[PDB]
Amino acid sequence: IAKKIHPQTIIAGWREATKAARQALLNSAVDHGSDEVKFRQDLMNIAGTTL
Amino acid sequence: AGADEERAETARLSSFIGAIAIGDLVKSTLGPKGMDKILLSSGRDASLMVTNDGATILKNIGVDNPAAKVLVDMSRVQDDEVGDGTTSVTVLAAELLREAESLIAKKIHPQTIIAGWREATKAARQALLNSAVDHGSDEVKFRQDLMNIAGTTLSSKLLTHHKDHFTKLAVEAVLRLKGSGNLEAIHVIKKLGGSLADSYLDEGFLLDKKIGVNQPKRIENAKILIANTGMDTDKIKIFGSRVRVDSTAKVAEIEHAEKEKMKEKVERILKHGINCFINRQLIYNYPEQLFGAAGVMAIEHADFVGVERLALVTGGEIASTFDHPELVKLGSCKLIEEVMIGEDKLIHFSGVALGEACTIVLRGATQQILDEAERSLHDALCVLAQTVKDSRTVYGGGCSEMLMAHAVTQLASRTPGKEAVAMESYAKALRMLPTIIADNAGYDSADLVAQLRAAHSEGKTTAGLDMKEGTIGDMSVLGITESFQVKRQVLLSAAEAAEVILRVDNIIKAAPR
Amino acid sequence: AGADEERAETARLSSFIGAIAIGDLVKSTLGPKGMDKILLSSGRDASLMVTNDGATILKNIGVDNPAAKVLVDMSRVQDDEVGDGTTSVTVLAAELLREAESLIAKKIHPQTIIAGWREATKAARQALLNSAVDHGSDEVKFRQDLMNIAGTTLSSKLLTHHKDHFTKLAVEAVLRLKGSGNLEAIHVIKKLGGSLADSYLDEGFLLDKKIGVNQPKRIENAKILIANTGMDTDKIKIFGSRVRVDSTAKVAEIEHAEKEKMKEKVERILKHGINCFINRQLIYNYPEQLFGAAGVMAIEHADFVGVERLALVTGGEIASTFDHPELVKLGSCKLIEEVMIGEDKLIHFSGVALGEACTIVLRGATQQILDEAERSLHDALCVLAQTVKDSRTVYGGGCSEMLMAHAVTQLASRTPGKEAVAMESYAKALRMLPTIIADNAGYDSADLVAQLRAAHSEGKTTAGLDMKEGTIGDMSVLGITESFQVKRQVLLSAAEAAEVILRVDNIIKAAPR
Amino acid sequence: AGADEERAETARLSSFIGAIAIGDLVKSTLGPKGMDKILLSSGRDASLMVTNDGATILKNIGVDNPAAKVLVDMSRVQDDEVGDGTTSVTVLAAELLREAESLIAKKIHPQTIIAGWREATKAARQALLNSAVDHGSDEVKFRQDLMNIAGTTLSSKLLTHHKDHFTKLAVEAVLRLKGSGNLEAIHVIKKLGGSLADSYLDEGFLLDKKIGVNQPKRIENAKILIANTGMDTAEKEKMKEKVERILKHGINCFINRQLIYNYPEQLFGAAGVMAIEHADFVGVERLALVTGGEIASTFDHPELVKLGSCKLIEEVMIGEDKLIHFSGVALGEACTIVLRGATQQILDEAERSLHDALCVLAQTVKDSRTVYGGGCSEMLMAHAVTQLASRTPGKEAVAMESYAKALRMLPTIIADNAGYDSADLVAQLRAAHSEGKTTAGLDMKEGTIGDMSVLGITESFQVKRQVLLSAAEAAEVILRVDNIIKAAPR
Amino acid sequence: AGADEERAETARLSSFIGAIAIGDLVKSTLGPKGMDKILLSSGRDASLMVTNDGATILKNIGVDNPAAKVLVDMSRVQDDEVGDGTTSVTVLAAELLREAESLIAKKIHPQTIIAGWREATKAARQALLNSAVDHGSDEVKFRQDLMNIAGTTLSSKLLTHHKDHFTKLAVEAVLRLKGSGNLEAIHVIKKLGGSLADSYLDEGFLLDKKIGVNQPKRIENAKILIANTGMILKHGINCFINRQLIYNYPEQLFGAAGVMAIEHADFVGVERLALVTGGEIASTFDHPELVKLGSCKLIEEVMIGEDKLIHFSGVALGEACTIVLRGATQQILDEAERSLHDALCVLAQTVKDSRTVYGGGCSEMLMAHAVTQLASRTPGKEAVAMESYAKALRMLPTIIADNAGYDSADLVAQLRAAHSEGKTTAGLDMKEGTIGDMSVLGITESFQVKRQVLLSAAEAAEVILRVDNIIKAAPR
């Protein structure tokens, strides 16, 4: 409201947000394999996170 | 305490108040990125309709005691002639009343001033034949088809990032409807779901509804059946209740009667080659088993408004009792099918032999504001059909308005007299339009007004307001243009509506608790 | 206020205030530039109505406590006799009361004072053939047909910007209306479609009904049939209901009777060449099917008032039962057709052989401003009819009022006693009319009054108030003349309205608590 | 909660309302067809007062809640530099505020609007000198010395039956006032006794005082003594010192700005010397310039330290009441005027009227520029300023046109009090000025446009330059602040 | 039933309001579009008085019930040791309170929020060396002598259209001033007239007085006489200057002699003139000749534009000079007197500090990007206090731009990107309306203004949080 203008141009920030999302999608973490079934990669991961 | 009796000065104010109240709601609508309002009142109102189109909402409701209803009704005739783009006619009339306070200062005659509006005709004609407008629209046409007025009408709306593409699309619709006979039969719907294109063009009329899970996916050389009376049978003039009986045998007599209704429906239907049945109401279950095996697609509780539109398209039908098939029905034939539109399933009627009616479909991103697209199409569709018929347009972005203002300012001092004060008041009215175009875009209005005048004053007609730029630029490069008849009529409509209200000042009120 | 019982001097004031309150609203209504007002009410009033005609609005509503409604009611009798032009009868009665303040000072017998307007009768003889007059109105007449009283009648009306042209059109209508008619065969309607002309003069009658969508678009060498009795045949003694019957045994007899009605209508019809059928009431469905094949257009439920007017136009008919066709029927045969006008579907009757009756169609945009045109026109028709018959007129724009005023001033001083005080008061009343016209001219009133009196004093009846001039000019060149009837009647009843109000003292009851 | 709830948008309105109430009352006051007003009040007010001078009535009363006291107060200092003639300054300042309605439409910074005031600087200047006020006043001049602008100030005023003759005389007074000296040494008092002329021009200063009944009736080749210290104070020694020094000089008159001691008074009568008790200081300073001056200190003051003119000092009976005349000043730089009227309030108006005359006329000689009256100057400037609003760049363009239309009301105000149609007047008027005739203006007598110069109505150049600068700042301060007037700050 | 009760959170509110009340009146003053306010008082206050700078007006008197008087007193000591710049120190302290509302949401310990202030003392130090910014102030300096910090001081002021040139001029005066030579003998006024420079720097001292009408207009090969005691031919005396009343008898003598004398000349002007002319021994009438030292290039009365002034010039010593200044006459013009005092202090600091930072807001944005990181490195309770301080820096870019007559929102984005890149030169250009190169402009800020401005803001903020009650009563 202290902007004192057209809020709608500011909406372009959402467009900006998709770029922001990209630096999250292409910039951090991830994992190497997951061959299927797997001897030790089966869990001790995300289920624990939810838990 | 009192009885709300208004005297002279105050009475004028109530006419004044009505014009200002309407202007605030409509001003948001003009120019890029307008607000969008729903308005639900209950009481013979069957939908919460959202419209940023000023003409449609003002007409729908006669809200209160103060005078304004008479002014509003006229704009529709204008719509008939062309009346669209951005709703500025009402706003322009409203600012006319602001000078009325200075009018008291102008101690003279209120209706002498009125001569200013006939004089507005002089201004209306001045807009005409003054300032080369444009020229083109040969037939079909490659580049000149769009990126013009539809874009400007939609410029006014927020959607113009993705949306200008949709506006571009709308000319294809006019091209297919070209040479057949005026502007008629255009229906637009929005789709829940997101695609970059945000719109698909179908060869025919579009509906939402399906018979059931069973039935052939698509029908060809389809015959169409429309029935006023439902397929439902039971209560007639004889009652049983909610009955089943004492054993098995008696149940058979009731069963046999139901079969007879099924039997008539299939026997009559197969000879015609029936491909699709559309009913505007509840449909009895028995015929669906029949329709599925036959290969006929029926629609339960189809909306009446779609049906009337469809009849013009197909060639019409006469709807009565089960005698309704064969030649009493005039179903047209090409292709009727349900086509996977992105996400949700829709049914499409197409290849209509008559060809006088056509349909366009817009997608969007799944919101109640999705309906914003429906609003944009009305804006786009109406202008282009006229663009074909007028064969004339004017430069957009307020180029036309600033030049006209320059010519009118000179005129007031030149004519000595009572008339000159009235003539000059009209002249600064044009000044606000440049101001509104700049304010909505996202730039400071004060700087814009004066910078704009210097370029127009110089003599360049092409130069105008560039909203994306934040300053001024070449309108022609943008391609934005305004239909020629919108300007002739808009100037006349403003004057006629405005004259009656200033001349009118007696308003009656009830009480304050 | 807030506590009220009336005795002697207090009662008189309520009569006094009511007259002044109405005078200001009606005063604007007098002269070439008048004013219009709108009133808003609920429970039988659809919306704010714009009333130019003072008599129409005063009759419609009883807004408040003070007594003046009874004075208002009398004006209607005047209206049928002649009524309109400008509303001046109420104003003169109201101005009578301002010097009543002088009367308390006078202190004797108010009844003795009443003798003063009997004296005004003397003024009436004085005003008899005193004031040159206008020779014109010989019959039909080329130039003097209008731009006279009708223009002045419409001067007050809020449509004069284009309306004065409409008025000019109306005399053409009166010329056909004189000699061999009455005051019949006059009908006019308004249609959407903004245009500078705002009206069309038709050579025939204007109607808006259709047989059905089917039937030939255009008919020629037309024959017109009018029937008093409806084509419908069935209900009589034992209708039962609309019917479908058990199988096909009993009902076959009833439709056969119907077939006889179907055939009689066609057999008589084909020989004549019948192009159009007009029936005033419900029409039977069976013949409708038959008319379409023949190529004959018929009108269902045509209004009786329109039909009879048409009968004089066509050549007449004798309307009886189905023996109506051939020779008893007389039908004009120029051209009958259905033509779309702007928006609303409409049909036109034209080329009438008689030539004594015609219809005028007005154009607008369906705002109630358009509604205003419907009865504005009515006002114009009435004044012209009087102008041909009277063969008597007086000079317009205040010319009549100043001349009489100079002469009446002499009478007060010349006649000794009680008579002198009562006559002088009547005389100053006339002075305000010149002043009112100047005020609504946009020109300084003080200067106007002074110069005005000198020209009338000089001896020129033709000279009068020219608002456009700002000064005194020659009324005759303008062509603005007032009909003789408006001046004699106003003087006669002005006296009587005054008589009931002050002839009594003490009105009995109706209080706030 | 105490009282009075108003902020930001409503703050402007209180300022707005004060300006409108004053403008209609003051408008009828202006020029030859000006009108008087009567006021009734209680408490230190006894009856109805009627003032024809707009500045005098405004100062006297702060009647109600709206704020306009400060705006009103400033005009008085204006009536020092020039201030009068006809009161138009308040009227023009008030109309400036009306455009503030358009300012809400601006919906931005009210202060950047203020730059319009500088627009006024170019705009006030333009038409100020791109038009000729009048071809010129030579300085001294015979026929054109007056019978013009002073008369116009007087036309509004009742006294102008014999007064107009008085007005012509004041110009002669400014002729001797010409120079680098500027505004000093002018004394005017109404006088008892009468003649048709109603005024006399003295070649020297006029003082109202007498030593006492005793003393020489008349002095010649008079010596003038001015003392800073009083004669008030062994006593016999003070008496003797004064007499021995006094006789050698020939001392004819002594003037002291304070109380005088009784002992010397007996001595002065026998000696032949006239002394003045409690003579006002303001008369004395002017006299020192006139007599060549003297150094005023203690009784050592006599001989050379004292310089005295000797042309003519006497006490003379005029009409009825005795007065003392100082005359024959060698310097010539300073002079005094004595007015002898018929006798009444109209006579008392004379002190009022040349006070006004001295300042208008004093710079008329020096400015060598005067503008045509009757609004001739105002219409011409309005035609020129209309072009300017379109011509200027950005902020300046909308603001510049608002100033321009303010000029239009002046033509209307002069015509309106006349009793003629204002609309018609504006129309005919603008065409004449636009054509190029500077002399042509509004003729109230005629009812249309006529030649202002023949009439003799002219306005000083200075009133137009200063009023335009003054009108701007007063409006600017009001918009600048919201509430106003409380106690000890932050 | 409601006399007045307040503890901790309510107590905080009275302190909170005092900071907000002062901030709205002061904020208008800041920047090019600064505003002048009018105040009226009774009791040894005659009429309404308006002051453009916040420090002068706040100190004169104390209005009311809420605490604020103690906060106000600190700025004058600050002014004595450096100065004004533009008033802003009070504003920064006031905005610190606005995050108090944020603190309740935090729900930890408001008292140790306070411990954050000594973090600030460190923060002023970290406002240094982690960022670059100086690289200048070598000696006299070629291009960067001025069009510097003074221009920023000037930016608030209206006159900047031609004034900025005047500001550039002021450092030249300081360079001559600089050294062991004490901060004395500098005199400056203003004059009305034309010329592009809009100001002249003269060789000698400027004075405005006249002997009287009857004296010689011009003197040459001038001799100067200064006497301690109140009231020639052999010396060839051209001008006499006396600090006090002058006796009338000599005045007649001087006029025919060809000698111009000055009555009641101010002592401060006289002493400066003495240093300038080589001095004099001011005794009794024995004073003329050798005991009197008089420079003789030329003394004359010169019309600068419209008004006549007496100018002393051609001084042999060179140690002390005078600045004329020029203007368009208004109370705003007297603001130049305000700015003048302001300018002298800045430059004196510049000679011996040997350090500066880029102006035009360049310093503030760079610090902001860096300070966001700084809170994180420190332990978290300490970090919250410092991070809040860091967000305060965002307003400064906005205030400079807002008063520029350009869109503030646009400015914030573009400004940050330039600073983020790593070039300290880029900053806010008010003239441009967009971001530009500050170094081309030549704007650099004195190192002292930044070091103590930070300290003043800190103290103003602390007084409100650490004391629960500032009130009084006595009813029982």
Coordinates of C-alpha atoms in Angstrom, one line a residue, chain D residues 69-70 109 111-112 118 294-295 304-305 307 473 476-477 480-482 484-490, chain E residues 25 33 35-42 45 48 57-59 61-63 72 158 161 248-249 331:
Chain D
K69 CA -6.6 35.8 10.5
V70 CA -3.0 35.5 9.3
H109 CA 3.0 15.8 -4.2
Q111 CA 4.8 20.8 -3.0
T112 CA 6.0 20.0 -6.6
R118 CA 8.0 30.0 -10.3
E294 CA 23.0 70.2 15.1
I295 CA 24.7 68.0 17.7
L304 CA 28.8 76.1 16.3
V305 CA 27.6 72.7 17.4
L307 CA 23.2 75.1 13.2
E473 CA 3.7 33.3 -1.3
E476 CA 1.8 28.8 -0.7
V477 CA 2.2 28.9 3.1
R480 CA 2.1 24.0 3.3
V481 CA 0.6 23.4 6.8
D482 CA -2.3 21.3 8.1
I484 CA -1.7 25.3 12.9
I485 CA -1.2 27.4 16.2
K486 CA -0.3 25.6 19.5
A487 CA 2.3 25.8 22.4
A488 CA 6.1 25.4 22.9
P489 CA 7.6 23.1 20.1
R490 CA 9.3 19.6 20.1
Chain E
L25 CA 7.8 16.2 11.0
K33 CA 12.0 17.8 -1.6
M35 CA 9.7 20.9 3.6
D36 CA 9.5 23.9 6.0
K37 CA 7.1 23.8 8.9
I38 CA 5.6 26.7 11.1
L39 CA 5.4 26.7 14.9
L40 CA 3.7 29.2 17.2
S41 CA 4.4 29.6 20.9
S42 CA 3.6 31.9 23.9
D45 CA 8.2 33.3 22.1
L48 CA 5.5 31.7 14.5
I57 CA 14.3 23.6 16.3
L58 CA 14.2 20.5 18.6
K59 CA 16.7 22.0 21.1
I61 CA 12.2 24.0 23.8
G62 CA 10.4 20.9 25.2
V63 CA 6.6 20.4 24.4
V72 CA 17.1 15.5 21.2
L158 CA 16.1 23.5 -3.1
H161 CA 20.0 23.6 -9.6
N248 CA 30.4 63.4 14.3
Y249 CA 33.1 66.2 14.1
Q331 CA 13.6 32.6 3.8

